[PDB]
């Protein structure tokens, strides 16, 4: 039965001999369930990419990372609770510059999103950065961090976190990889030319999913992750999180 | 005692009240608003609705379990096995009846669970399993470590999936109905496996003698089949 539930249900008072549980009373429970919703549960701003390129004297100097949630492991076990997911990605780029007193100049950065299926002749100065079809954003170092919303891009109705099958129709696709789902690459470079300064730029990319729709909840993964490409397990030698003992050991059953 | 007859065959079954519809929904034909392909799907009337009985597995005290990926066991069987390679796309549901016959002197418990989108894994290696290791065919496979469900998850939490309990006290048979679970409306028979049928002996077998063999029969009825991309 599908019904609207704003808060947890109340309790009816109880009341010789029968042919249920215990003696209860009348309680009005005002505790809100709103924070347990799938939206509130899965949606949080987390750091999915951390990279600092070495920049001192160049007289490679950028980064592109195909987005997958398996890189941040706290989010991986977070998103492996469900099978199919439907959400809109909200990306925010933060730029911090360290020192290897001069003072900090204000660099201009360009964060360009390249969808899956666009050939990239990857270079810093190559023309694929100036392509008008690719959506780009320009932001300085001192300002509110650049924030864009990525829509839901898929051939199917929702993403596949656990994919049982193989890639393509050549009968060899590296088990556990879904051909239908790849969002694309996120290309970020410094717009300014080469300045012989020893400052290191640290870019942080945050992703908060919204409009989240989940299906088929799955058991959590107790064992550690061996690799990001598949489900293989090993387990710690001693308990906990082992093959023999996942739960901690105690003295005796009567203890 | 009540017999379930669908198609040109049938099997006598034990009465079990309140069977399991997976996630509380009954499989139905593809609605018009969710359709994609503009062609006309061929609908078998009694053809794909007959009960397909796999090979009965011998269940001993030291048996870890068994798993059958759908429709991998059905890849080649009967007339439905023809439409596997004879059509480019399909969507179907499944009515699974698992019946374990034993006397009143046997003790044990069987957890029959249908795992949607089951991604397996290998122990103590980073190498992804091969093609024959995943897709068994009619033979099936045996769990190496059923306590972790071979995927690294926990068996104690496996009850979140559609399941029924086979206990040698109350009910010796189970009936599970699986609708179409996919992101896409239709899928490819030889590539992706939507469900997985896992029979896990949570409590092992026991008796006075050391050697005891209790057979298990698994029956699968592909209800609400559709097919597109006619070739050959």
């Amino acid at each position: 039965i599908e019904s609207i539930i704003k808060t947890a249900t109340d309790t009816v008072k109880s009341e010789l001999g029968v042919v249920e549980a215990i003696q209860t009373r009348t309680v009005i429970n005002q505790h809100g369930v709103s924070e347990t919703l799938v939206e509130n549960f899965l949606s949080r701003a987390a750091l999915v990419s951390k990279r600092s390129f070495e920049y001192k004297d160049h007289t490679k100097n950028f980064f592109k990372w195909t987005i997958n949630t398996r890189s941040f492991v706290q989010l991986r076990r977070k998103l492996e609770l469900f099978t199919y997911l439907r959400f809109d990605a909200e990306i925010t780029i933060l730029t911090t510059v360290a020192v290897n007193y001069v003072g900090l100049p204000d660099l201009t950065l360009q964060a360009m999103f390249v969808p899956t299926g666009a050939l990239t002749p990857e270079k810093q100065d190559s023309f694929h950065w100036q392509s008008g079809s690719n959506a780009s954003v320009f932001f300085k170092i001192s300002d509110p961090p650049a924030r864009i919303t990525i829509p839901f891009m898929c051939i199917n109705s929702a993403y596949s976190v656990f994919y049982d099958g193989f890639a393509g129709f050549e009968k060899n696709g590296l088990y556990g990889i879904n051909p239908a789902d790849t969002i694309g690459n996120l290309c970020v470079r410094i717009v300014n030319e080469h300045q012989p300064v020893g400052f290191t730029v640290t870019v942080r990319v945050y992703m908060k999913p919204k409009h989240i729709k989940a299906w088929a909840p799955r058991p959590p993964r107790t064992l550690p992750y061996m690799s990001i490409a598949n489900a293989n397990y090993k387990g710690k030698e001693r308990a906990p999180n082992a093959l023999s003992a996942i739960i901690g050991n105690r003295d005796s059953v009567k203890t | 005692v009540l017999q379930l007859k669908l198609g040109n065959s049938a099997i006598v079954t034990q009465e079990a009240a309140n069977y399991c519809c997976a996630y509380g929904e009954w499989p139905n034909y593809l609605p018009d608003h969710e359709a994609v392909a503009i062609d006309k799907p061929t609908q078998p009337e009694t053809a794909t609705d007959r009960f397909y009985t796999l090979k009965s597995v011998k269940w001993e005290t030291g048996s870890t379990g068994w798993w059958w990926k759908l429709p991998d066991a059905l890849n080649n069987i009967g007339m439905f096995g023809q439409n596997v390679q004879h059509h480019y796309l399909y969507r179907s549901g499944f009515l699974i009846h698992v019946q374990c016959n034993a006397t009143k002197f046997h003790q044990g418990a069987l957890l029959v669970v249908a795992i949607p989108e089951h991604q397996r894994g290998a122990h103590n290696t980073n190498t992804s399993p091969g093609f024959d290791d995943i897709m068994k065919g009619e033979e099936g496979g045996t769990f190496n470590h059923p306590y972790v469900l071979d995927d690294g998850t926990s068996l104690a939490c496996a009850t979140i999936f559609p399941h029924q309990w086979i206990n040698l006290r109350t009910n010796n048979s189970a009936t599970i109905v699986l609708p179409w679970m996919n992101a896409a409306p239709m899928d490819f028979p030889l590539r992706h496996n939507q469900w997985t049928l896992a029979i896990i002996p949570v409590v092992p077998l026991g008796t006075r003698t050391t050697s005891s063999m209790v057979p298990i029969t698994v029956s699968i009825a592909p209800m609400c089949c559709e097919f597109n991309g006619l070739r050959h």
Epitope: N172, G173, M226 | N126, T127, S128, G130, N144
Partner: antibody, heavy 119, light 108 residues
Framework: QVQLQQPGAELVMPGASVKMSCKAS????????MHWVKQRPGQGLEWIGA????????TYNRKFKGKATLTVDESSSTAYMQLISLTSEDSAVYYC????????????WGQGTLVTVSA | DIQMTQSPSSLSASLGERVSLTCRAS??????LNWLQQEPDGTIKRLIY???SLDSGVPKRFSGSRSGSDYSLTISSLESEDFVDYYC?????????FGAGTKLELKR
């Protein structure tokens, strides 16, 4: 400290069977995989198969499927390779490797055997 | 099955000459690849594992890098014992496969 022992010649007439032996020491044998690789005189290397040391589960090549059988013994800490229906097609140097959780590598190899069959 | 194409199958070079062997995979195997050194005496020994990292006990003259569609084995300087049969192996997915092999020759 860690090595692999696979000596012997083992010349045999066609149509017979052979059970190889790989005995590993210097580490924990039950916790690591076992592998098998053949060295042909024709300048080539083929992958025989892999076996989990724990109980049973194995993986075989399509060409050698059904002609090879792998089994291990956790007591003697040995690895055995069973072959049936030996023809003149099989002549090669069989190797056994280990692997592991990380890298699942080939790092340690055995000496190998010289296998020649003749009618 | 994923096939590893090892090229060239043979080459002729003298001492102090940098050579490279490029293997191409049909399906992307990730960062998992191995290089095996086969000595003429019948003993195979690993060299490169997981791209960058190198075996301990093996001299630093061996090196490797990834073009991102391809894998290459770069040797700084050849030696008398550096003439062997090189094999690029993929441990990423079952079944595991071998390269075609490469035999080194000396200019005479």
């Amino acid at each position: 400290q860690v090595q692999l022992q696979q000596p012997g010649a083992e010349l045999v007439m066609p149509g017979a069977s052979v059970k190889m032996s790989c005995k590993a020491s210097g580490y924990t044998f039950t916790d690591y995989w076992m592998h098998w690789v053949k060295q042909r005189p024709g300048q080539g290397l083929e992958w025989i198969g892999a076996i989990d040391t724990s109980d049973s589960y194995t993986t075989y090549n399509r060409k050698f499927k059904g002609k090879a059988t792998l089994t291990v013994d956790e007591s003697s800490s040995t690895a055995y390779m069973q072959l049936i229906s030996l023809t003149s097609e099989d002549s090669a140097v069989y190797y056994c490797a280990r692997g592991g959780g990380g890298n699942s590598p080939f790092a340690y190899w055995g000496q190998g055997t010289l296998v020649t069959v003749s009618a | 099955d994923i096939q590893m194409t090892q090229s060239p199958s043979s080459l002729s070079a003298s001492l102090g000459e940098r050579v490279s062997l490029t293997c191409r995979a049909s399906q992307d195997i990730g960062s998992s690849l191995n290089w095996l050194q086969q000595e003429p005496d019948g003993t195979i020994k690993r060299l490169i594992y997981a791209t960058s990292s190198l075996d301990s006990g093996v001299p630093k003259r061996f090196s490797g890098s990834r073009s991102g569609s391809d894998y290459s084995l770069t040797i700084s300087s050849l030696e008398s014992e550096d003439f062997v049969d090189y094999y690029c192996l993929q441990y990423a997915s079952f079944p595991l496969t071998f390269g075609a092999g490469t035999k080194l020759e000396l200019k005479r």
